[PDB]
RNA sequence: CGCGGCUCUGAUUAGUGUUAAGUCGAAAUACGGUUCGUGUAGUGGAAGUUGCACGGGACUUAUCAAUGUUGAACAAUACGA
């Protein structure tokens, strides 16, 4: 069965300094990751996914419509742990290599800050904001910001559930609305018939998530309160998060090829 | 003296044993060229042969017109003689 694993630096015991109280991280990871794994176990208790890993269940249950409920619990457990696994007990100084690509791609580290934080609030819904690394066979490494919805995964092997654009406020009769609507059916029709829209490289090496931001309410509603009056809330939660990012590890997983 | 038993003999007559170098057929052993044998009743130079029922110690010697299957798609980081 799938069991809960400890956190990075005993966050469950002490928690982050000025980002999450030990009681909040307890309700956010222990009392929730355990709840998700209990449901995940019941769904794979007697199937081939019984001994498979979370990410393996994600890629294997991405397109199958009869396993969408299994994808949620598997993808949620993977995304949730991916969030806490990149937090540092003490602020870290951004490396030189990473500090270069961020400025070359987004213009400035402060610009990337507002883009991710701005996307978290602009999304108005529980999800995850990713910092993806895209590198086509001919093009160089390029960093962008991808925002997934409730349990969507950023990996290319699970593009079937790359839930990054709501349909209730993005598909309409307006000029931009019709464009989104066309792309909607173009994906559903292409995916259904098996055709691929964007050619990808083998092994899903195109997109490599490096950083994540969990915007679900169970992670900040208790600590930063609702947010009425401009104090705390989902806004301050995203701001304080930006200070505890493990830029040392973020740069590592990025694997920015040295060319300077 | 009679009857019975026993022994020997008897014109004439039957059977069987032995005997490589004769004669006439070819009945059996192979589907032995009419399946062979048992019983019973006939028949023919001889072995044979005929009827009727019976036995296998003769047919288990037996070896597909059911003609033999798209038994749940494809693609993925799954899969890799
Ligand atoms: Mg005499
Ligand atoms: Mg005869
Ligand atoms: Mg004869
Ligand atoms: Mg005969
Ligand atoms: Mg006879
Ligand atoms: Mg006659
Ligand atoms: Mg015979
Ligand atoms: Mg015989």
From Swiss-Prot:
Mitochondrion among keywords: yes
User: Can you tell which superkingdom this protein's organism belongs to?
Assistant: Eukaryota
Swiss-Prot/TrEMBL keywords = Mitochondrion
Q: Where in or outside the cell?
A: Mitochondrion
Stretches assigned to coiled coil = none
Extract one GO cellular component term from the record.
cytoplasm
Q: Does the keyword Mitochondrion apply?
A: yes
Q: Predominant location of this chain?
A: mitochondrion
List GO molecular-function terms, semicolon-separated. Answer: metal ion binding; superoxide dismutase activity
Q: What does this protein do?
A: Component of the mitochondrial ribosome (mitoribosome), a dedicated translation machinery responsible for the synthesis of mitochondrial genome-encoded proteins, including at least some of the essential transmembrane subunits of the mitochondrial respiratory chain. The mitoribosomes are attached to the mitochondrial inner membrane and translation products are cotranslationally integrated into the membrane.
What family does the entry list? Belongs to the mitochondrion-specific ribosomal protein mS42 family.
Assembly information from the UniProt record = Component of the mitochondrial small ribosomal subunit (mt-SSU). Mature N.crassa 74S mitochondrial ribosomes consist of a small (37S) and a large (54S) subunit. The 37S small subunit contains a 16S ribosomal RNA (16S mt-rRNA) and 32 different proteins. The 54S large subunit contains a 23S rRNA (23S mt-rRNA) and 42 different proteins. mS42 forms a homodimer, in contrast to the mS42-mS43 heterodimer in yeast, building a large protuberance adjacent to the mRNA channel exit in the mt-SSU body.
Protein name per its UniProtKB record: Small ribosomal subunit protein mS42
Its organism's taxonomic lineage begins at: Eukaryota, Fungi, Dikarya, Ascomycota, Pezizomycotina
